């Protein structure tokens, strides 16, 4: 019974651990020696999208790489024209407790996610002159922690409860529910192919899922504390997680091993947000030590700092073409960085 | 172009309306409510009028905003920092829960759990300078609860006075001195009674005190 199940679980644990360690030698540091290590990004603040008056929790760019949405504790959702720093839209929110947000693939629904446990969807290109809420995705017990967009009618959200869910915006009911986690699910990212989505939880473990079926494809472990930021590689078969244990771990979708653990001794604070550049080479992580950081994915070294934030940097995202990066922070400033030379 | 000029005018209009909203929001005082179970958090959300209850009980020219959050049966580490900017934390402890041990958890008279909660709340890195109001939720029934069983199995070090003076002089002091940073933050305390308005007048006084103190730290003179 219980003893038999425990023995089977222990036997399965040995098999998966040995399989992960059976990848030949795979000395990452020894073999990862290329002639293109980023020395110092030194990205300068091209624009400062001032105007938020509270801690900024999430920012998401657009399909056009020009409009970006931003969510903050002031109960405000702002669509910026990052090209000329113009507020295209300012959507007031029912709940001032956003923790994450997104932009529809058609950048027409910028549904976000908050502790009220509901993604209220906001129609942008409507016939009327104002942006209005279309449908609210109710049915979650925990706080919404990563509320994303597959298409104009399909949204998958991460909640505080140890379960994720896929919804139909038109009907408002969960077409699927993904319940494999044990603790507080904190983040969730969608692959470019929109067939698998990987979500990280406070159980120090991240699990992929199949959107169509509702079963976790596979799990990954290794973190010493709770995850608070996950993001998909632009390739789509990889992802890096930012936990409170002051390290960033990269896990391939297939292999259960860790490519690199991005951390430094001087940092005793965890990572709050993680995004990726279009090259799959510039991992930007928003740390708690009042400034963002730029990590390369190959050398696992701190190849850049973005020390322009007064308070803790809480969110950041890179454009679809790699043009910019809008790192929001608890100091209420969205700094849009672009490298110059 | 005339298009970009109109876009810039629209953006400036958004700036103006948004700054007005932020300055209005600023006036809204926030109060995170963290009583335990059986702590009459209800008695408080009732007479002063999924996930959370952002009760707006603005009553005396103060834009009150009490976030009653007890429905989140989840880890408190990753959503308590969202309340960094908050005037005060309204903690509720049931005084009568001083002899009732947990049936399943086998806890220490349902008080060491409350003491651990108060220590965790009053010592977060996000609550160093945030004042805490404490509400003795079940003080009225504690007089009856102490007449039949005393405070000796839990704290034999208590002096004993057979009245609620002993309760004030045994556990209230323990809650007060549990504040490690006795200088940065103040721990206001009150007895949650059936008074019509005293239970909220104490809250209002604590808000006005924390407000003034914060304003003194805003004009660079404190």
């Amino acid at each position, epitope marked *: 019974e219980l003893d038999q199940l425990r023995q089977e679980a222990e036997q399965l644990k040995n098999q998966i651990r040995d399989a992960r360690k059976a990848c030949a030698d795979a000395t990452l540091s020894q073999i990862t020696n290329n002639i293109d290590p980023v020395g110092r990004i030194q990205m300068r603040t091209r624009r400062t999208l001032r105007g938020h008056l509270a801690k900024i929790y999430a920012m998401h760019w657009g399909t056009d790489s020009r*409009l970006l949405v931003s969510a903050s504790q002031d109960g405000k959702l702002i669509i910026w024209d990052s090209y000329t720093t113009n507020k295209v839209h300012a959507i007031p929110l029912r709940s001032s407790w956003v923790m994450t947000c997104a932009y529809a693939p058609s950048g027409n629904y910028v549904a976000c996610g908050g502790l009220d446990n509901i993604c209220s969807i906001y129609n942008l290109k409507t016939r009327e002159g104002n942006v209005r809420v279309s449908r609210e995705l109710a049915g979650h017990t925990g706080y919404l922690s990563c509320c994303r967009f597959l298409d104009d009618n399909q949204i998958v959200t991460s909640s505080g409860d140890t379960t994720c869910a896929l919804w139909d915006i038109e009907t408002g009911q969960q077409t699927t529910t993904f319940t494999g986690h044990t603790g507080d699910v904190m983040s969730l990212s969608l692959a470019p192919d929109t067939r698998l989505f990987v979500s990280g939880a406070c159980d120090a473990s991240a699990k992929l899922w199949d959107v169509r079926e509702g079963m976790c494809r596979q799990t990954f472990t290794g973190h010493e504390s709770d995850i608070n930021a996950i993001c998909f590689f632009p390739n789509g078969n990889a992802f890096a997680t930012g936990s409170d244990d002051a390290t960033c771990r990269l896990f391939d979708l297939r292999a259960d091993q860790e490519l690199m653990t991005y951390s430094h001794d001087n940092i005793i604070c965890g990572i709050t947000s993680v995004s990726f550049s279009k090259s799959g080479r510039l991992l930007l992580a928003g740390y708690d030590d009042f400034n963002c950081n730029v990590w390369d994915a190959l050398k696992a070294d701190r190849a850049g700092v973005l020390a322009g934030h007064d308070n803790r940097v809480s969110c950041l995202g890179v454009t679809d073409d790699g043009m910019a990066v809008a790192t929001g922070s608890w100091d209420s400033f969205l700094k849009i960085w672009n490298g110059s030379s | 172009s005339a298009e970009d000029k109109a876009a810039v005018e*629209r953006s400036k209009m958004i700036d103006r309306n948004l700054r007005e909203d932020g300055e209005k929001a600023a006036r809204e005082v926030k109060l995170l409510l963290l009583g335990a179970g059986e702590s009459g958090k209800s008695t408080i959300v009732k007479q002063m009028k999924t996930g959370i209850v952002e009760t707006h009980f603005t009553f005396k020219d103060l834009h009150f905003k009490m976030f009653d959050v007890g429905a989140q049966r989840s880890e408190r580490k990753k959503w308590i920092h969202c309340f960094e900017g908050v005037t005060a934390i309204i903690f509720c402890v049931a005084l009568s829960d001083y002899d009732l041990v947990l049936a399943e958890d086998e806890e220490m008279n349902r008080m060491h759990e409350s003491m651990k909660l108060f220590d965790s709340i009053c010592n977060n890195k996000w609550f160093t300078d945030t004042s805490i109001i404490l509400f003795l939720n079940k003080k009225d029934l504690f007089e009856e609860k102490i007449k039949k069983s005393p405070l000796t199995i839990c704290y034999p070090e208590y002096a004993g006075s057979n009245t609620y003076e002993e309760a004030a002089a045994y556990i209230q002091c323990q809650f007060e001195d549990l504040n490690k940073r006795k200088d940065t933050k103040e721990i206001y305390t009150h007895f949650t009674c059936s008074t019509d308005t005293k239970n909220v007048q104490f809250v209002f006084d604590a808000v006005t005190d924390v407000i003034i103190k914060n304003n003194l730290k805003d004009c660079g003179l404190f």
Partner: single-chain antibody
Amino acid sequence: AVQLVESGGGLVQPGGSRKLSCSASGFAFSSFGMHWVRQAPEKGLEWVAYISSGSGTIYYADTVKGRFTISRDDPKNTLFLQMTSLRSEDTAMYYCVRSIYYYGSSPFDFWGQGTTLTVSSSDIVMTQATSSVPVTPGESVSISCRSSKSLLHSNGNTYLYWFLQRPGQSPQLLIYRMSNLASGVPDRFSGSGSGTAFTLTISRLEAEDVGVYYCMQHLEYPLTFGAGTKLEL
């Protein structure tokens, strides 16, 4: 549900004054910039005035400067245009057209029904020799216009606005910015060009597609119209 209806037009004794009221419903006019467009009988359109979103920017017609004034009020959700000293030439079909100005928006999308005003008894210039092309329905129709100077702004948007005026109806935006299709318009309409050279293309012509086509410029402060191609039965 968008409904722009005009009022305050008809016959007025010479030398008088009248107020043109545009009633707005079905949309948030407070976030919209309102224009006024004239149309002389058997001729092209022409600009009266414009108010930006929030009244922070105004403009006026060169031939109506000072004489005509435009005032909006968002509380009551309607638009006014007061004109004084109505001359004999101030007799045309007046249209009330909305426009929202932000990135990727759709200016000059919805035109009002329009009201007529009659009386008793530098800028961009259009060079269009052709104004009546008898084309039978069924095959492709190509419409073109001419502009004085270049349209390609440093923003990259050639602010050329196409419109179709149906017989006994209101103008409709076909392709704003010379390259992007508007809302509620069949995909058969198309428009492309480079700077001063541009054209409007229709794959197939329907019975309802008959009407006079028009071209508009928005680069500079004045928005000069012209007498575009007219399609006959």
